[PDB]
Amino acid sequence: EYLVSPITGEKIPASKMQEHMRIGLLDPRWLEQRDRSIREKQSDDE
Amino acid sequence: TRLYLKAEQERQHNYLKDGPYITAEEAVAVYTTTVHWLESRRFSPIPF
Amino acid sequence: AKLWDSKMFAEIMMKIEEYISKQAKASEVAAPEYRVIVDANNLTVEIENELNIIHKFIRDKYSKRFPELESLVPNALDYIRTVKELGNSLDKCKNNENLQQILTNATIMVVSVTASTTQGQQLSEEELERLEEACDMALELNASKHRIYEYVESRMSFIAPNLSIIIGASTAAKIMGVAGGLTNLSKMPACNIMLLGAQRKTLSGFSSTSVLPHTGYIYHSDIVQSLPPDLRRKAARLVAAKCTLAARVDSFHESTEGKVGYELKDEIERKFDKWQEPPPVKQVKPLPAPLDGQRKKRGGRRYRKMKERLGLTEIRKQANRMSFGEIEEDAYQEDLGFSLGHLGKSGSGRVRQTQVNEATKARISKTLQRTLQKQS
Amino acid sequence: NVMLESRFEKMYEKIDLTLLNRLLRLIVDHNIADYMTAKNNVVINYKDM
Amino acid sequence: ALSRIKRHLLTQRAFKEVGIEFMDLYSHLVPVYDVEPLEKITDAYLDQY
Amino acid sequence: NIANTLMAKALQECPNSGILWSEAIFLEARPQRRTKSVDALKKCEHDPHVLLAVAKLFWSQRKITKAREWFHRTVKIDSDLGDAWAFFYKFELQHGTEEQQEEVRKRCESAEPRHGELWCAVSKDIANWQKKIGDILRLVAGRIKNTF
Amino acid sequence: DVNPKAYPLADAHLTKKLLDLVQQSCNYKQLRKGANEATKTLNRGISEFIVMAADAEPLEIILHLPLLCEDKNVPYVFVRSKQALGRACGVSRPVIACSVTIKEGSQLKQQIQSIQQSIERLLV
Amino acid sequence: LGVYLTKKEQKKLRRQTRREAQKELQEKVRLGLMPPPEPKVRISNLMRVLGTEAVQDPTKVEAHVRAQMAKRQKAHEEANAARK
């Protein structure tokens, strides 16, 4: 089946709808937070 | 504090496993004495 | 009357249906066996109803002798056994070896204590013999119920395979009998299955949590009891939901082998493993480095409110001012260090009394307001 | 004239909750007695213990 | 507050965990119990009554 | 089961029916007689048959004080209605004292505000109406035509 | 098609109205989610119709709902997707059974009768 | 057919859109595209933002504040009328 996106205005397969809503609104500041959490982790000493 | 709490856990487990340590005869004697005392003094129970 | 009519009904049921159940049980040692399961599930309900009637009659008859034991012993079968053992003679209540099995040691003290201060008069010979015959009938009905439950346990490998896979056939039989049969248990919501066979145990001084309220066969089943006590209500809920799913599957005789039963049992085990999983590695947060320099902080309505709440108040300004040379009498006995200062004492320069800054009022947190909304 | 001064060694730690509940029901409302004896049966906590 | 107190007296039989510390008198340990303030109000009113 | 289906259809088409709801209480099995069969029922209406049914349910649970309180409430809210007097008398004889039973019987005497149509209520509710039942009453010529 | 035991199975035109009315009832605090709550509503005699999905994994865990609906004289209809029913219920998780409940003075009453008539037309 | 995003999902979408617009404005102000925002002043706010200049020319300050208030109201009514 095919469904219209309430977040993107595009047609998507019905099987990917749950993941499409789950990752179509992944807040980009989450990616920023993960980036700054990994940048500090790499620079950490022993 | 840690030692006393470990001992208290042991004591509570002993009470739970071994049941009440007051025999029914002793409890009945205590309760009867209290009842007789309250009846003698004419004590009205404290209401809600 | 009602005691005799119930006896006639029990005899009529045992003559035909119980005999057929025994014959079907001993057969393996045009007359199918599914109808035998149906009429056995009817017998358990009939026996429960007539046992409730018998318990009502026994309680009514015994309220003349000991009118409190019904509240002290809430369970019907335990009440019947206790009234059978005690009877009119309450003198033998001391060191009742025969009562330790019927009642726990917590309520044995309660019944012994209450029996010493009971106003109920002794029964008569006719009342005693009627009560004894009623108790004997109740125990006979209980034995018949145990036999029919044994038969249902034997047949659960054939009637309810998925539900017997998820939970043991003993718990399977005990929930199927009390629910009124496989169809009635499958038409029952998952929240009502966990409460099947939940005896309203009377809290004997102890808290309600110690008595484990709202607990049934599922909770006391083998898989749920194989969990730490802090993780047993969640296990009971999950097992009840999966058992409801399995029962709904079985009521239509689908998945006879038990593919759905295993597909649910293995995910139950997976959830149990996930709950008991060791906690992951969490990095220790080091203390923040000591801070030097200037950091710009905003100001506004929030900052103004915070400063008003935290800033010095006039009465709290007078509190930390002590007159020089004017020795004051000690105010608070428990703490001699405590002193009002210029508050209420001459020399403060204020003719009128300082008023309370209402911005420093103490009030509950936001989340503590939420609890009050869930309490009233 | 003989005077005996003594103390009940572990009265606080040996007050049976069921017997205390009965003795309280003797003098106070059974709801109040049940509340008090249930309050005396709670989880004692300290750090990780 | 009085209505909440009476409701707790009637229907409340389960309570939250209470913390325990020990006052060190250097000769023995005196247990000290921290109860929830919401239950503390009810217990204090019950004691006074 | 067919009786249960018919009762479900009847309640759905005719809600707020005191007698229908009171009888539907006793169609349902004992585990579900309280939590769902009588709670939403008391939510729906407060018919004299409803209060009588609640008192009967409490009596079947051997809650004597609750049963007596609910029977007194039923009598106070509506007297000579729903034939509750027969059940009240039976319950008082079974559980209440002889003095209490005698007092209840005396209160069940014929009076315009209380138990004036007690026989009529019994005939209407308990279906005790008969061809000779009306003739047995004072209005032998009159109540016979009214009664079945 | 995919599931033969599913009956009655609503078509594309009807399932849109079913899901829209389910969402509207959710907005009016008139919807119950899950097979257990649908069963509870049917027992309590508060549901006027019941919807469920045709793609439940056993399909026998919501198959008692048609029997209970016939017992309680409540219309029932099946849809072809659990995820869409869950979304119409306002829940991210898939829902395989939803109930619409009787309310006093509700403004959804006319749509309720319209959908019940369509559901009855689907059966037989 | 169409799908209905849940209430939490609607809240997330609205919050993300508002944050996107806010970041757009902030980066426009950073690079000097738009003038930096002026403080929003109402009558009760007049003595906090324009306090020192409202003692010298009180009525000019009042007129400026009320002009700002009207312009804020002017844009709202203009948007409502254009959208209608």
Task: Walk me through the structure.
This is part of a larger assembly, with one copy of chain A (about 45 residues), three copies of chain B, one copy of chain C (about 375 residues), one copy of chain F (about 150 residues), one copy of chain G (about 120 residues) and one copy of chain H (about 80 residues). In chain A, about 50% of the residues lie in helices and about 15% in strands. Chain A contains two helices and two strands; from the N terminus they run E-E-H-H. In chain A, strands 1-2 form a two-stranded antiparallel sheet. The radius of gyration of chain A is 17 Å and the shape is elongated. Chain B is mainly alpha-helical. The longest helix of chain B is centred in the last third of the chain and has 18 residues, at about 25-40. Chain C has 18 helices and no strands. Chain F has eleven helices and no strands. Chain F has helices at about 1-15, 20-25, 30-35, 40-45, 50-60, 65-75, 85-95, 100-105, 120-125, 130-135, 145. In chain F, helix 1 (about 1-15) runs antiparallel to helix 2 (about 20-25). Strand 1 of chain D pairs parallel with strand 1 of chain E, so a sheet runs across the interface. Chain C: Its main location: nucleus.
Principal-axis shape of chain A equals elongated
Structural classification of chain A: alpha+beta
Beta-strand content bin of chain F = under 5%
What helical percentage do the residues of chain A reach?
A: 40-55%
Largest interface: B-D, 21 and 16 residues
Question: Given the structure, what is the number of helices of chain F?
Answer: 11
**Alpha-carbon Rg of chain F, integer:** 16 Å
What pattern of helices and strands is seen along the backbone of chain A? EEHH
What is the number of helices of chain A?
A: 2
Overall shape of chain F: globular
